[PDB]
Design a protein around this ligand. Structure first.
Ligand SMILES: CC(=O)N[C@@H]1[C@@H](O)[C@H](O[C@@H]2O[C@H](CO)[C@H](O)[C@H](O[C@@H]3O[C@H](CO)[C@@H](O[C@@H]4O[C@H](CO)[C@H](O)[C@H](O)[C@H]4O)[C@H](O)[C@H]3NC(C)=O)[C@H]2O)[C@@H](CO)O[C@H]1O
Ligand SMILES: CC(=O)N[C@@H]1[C@@H](O)[C@H](O[C@@H]2O[C@H](CO)[C@H](O)[C@H](O[C@@H]3O[C@H](CO)[C@@H](O[C@@H]4O[C@H](CO)[C@H](O)[C@H](O)[C@H]4O)[C@H](O)[C@H]3NC(C)=O)[C@H]2O)[C@@H](CO)O[C@H]1O
Lengths: 151, 151
């Protein structure tokens, strides 16, 4: 599929939303974290957070699709409870009430984000990704699974 | 300064705004294009375009600081007269009426943009950069120089 991928941690299958769970041993270079799910018809926004611990005060990468103002997606980092400068991509690659595949690839200098197998946005690491030991997902959606795979 | 840099094309010194001029032999991997100048007090927006020819219908990378809504910067690509999805960084690293150094580094997969020696934004190549043979600069500003340097 381009490349041979191997599980790095067992999948979370049908996780309950809102979901907070471990990324075991922390994010690693070449890790692909894939979310397969569906947005609800009543969704306005949803969030995937890659964060350090359960509390949400330190979020290395906040990925936040907003079905507002035509549809756009916000990427940001939170440090000690403070949001940094937002990066917005003025495009909405998700459709309300429709299935989606969302994949985050950890590279040395950036995250690469694919939506429905197509590249969507990159995000430069502002803090070391290996400090990320938690994924948190919220919003009006369900998930079939989250997988963790490496080359 | 981190690294030894060599001229790749002779600088444009005190170019007249609005400026349109050749990038000789086209953009190349590892080229650094540096703009040194000052915004006017009456500036609202300015633009640096990396483009294919003089006409502006195909702009590989449009870099557009806007002193509006608190200050933000738009990055985009134009193909056949059509703008793609905007990438906005909700931060303004320039100050009206103040000198600035603006550096574009061409890497294999992205441009990296530094403002006043600090990283500001990356922009993934949407089209091959080597098709870019023109730089165009407009807005209420003056420039001391544009240099072209490689490692
Ligand atoms: C289906 C539907 O009805 N959805 C609505 C959205 O389409 C709508 O979103 C707005 O739609 C208009 C088109 O009608 C534009 O896409 C809006 O975006 C703005 O577009 C302008 C012009 O392209 C753009 O300014 C230009 O930017 C380029 C670089 O990209 C260059 O710098 C030019 O010099 C400059 O003029 C501007 O930045 C851009 N703004 C944003 C926020 O993206 C788009 O907002 C919404 C809102 O009306 O309503 C939906 O429901
Ligand atoms: C000096 C001065 O007066 N300049 C003014 C600007 O400061 C002002 O810009 C607005 O300033 C406010 C603070 O007063 C905010 O920074 C505005 O940005 C919005 O902030 C909200 C809350 O942080 C943010 O939503 C949050 O986003 C995070 C991720 O970043 C997360 O998803 C949260 O769930 C969410 O609530 C929102 O996205 C952000 N919007 C923008 C457009 O950046 C900022 O606009 C302007 C405008 O009033 O006036 C200047 O003159």
């Amino acid at each position: 599929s381009g490349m041979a991928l191997f599980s790095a941690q067992s999948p979370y299958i049908n996780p309950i939303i809102p979901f907070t769970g471990p990324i075991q041993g922390g994010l690693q270079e070449g890790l692909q974290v894939t979310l397969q799910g569906t947005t609800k018809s009543f969704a306005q926004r949803f969030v995937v957070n890659f964060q350090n611990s359960f509390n949400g005060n330190d979020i290395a990468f906040h990925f936040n699709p907003r079905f507002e103002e035509g549809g756009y997606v916000v990427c940001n980092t939170k440090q000690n409870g403070q949001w940094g400068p937002e990066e917005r991509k003025m495009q909405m690659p998700f459709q309300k009430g429709m299935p989606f595949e969302l994949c985050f690839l950890v590279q040395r200098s950036e995250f690469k984000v694919m939506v429905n197998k197509k590249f969507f946005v990159q995000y430069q690491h502002r803090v070391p990704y290996h400090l990320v030991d938690t994924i948190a997902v919220s919003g009006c959606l369900k998930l079939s699974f989250i997988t963790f795979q490496t080359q």
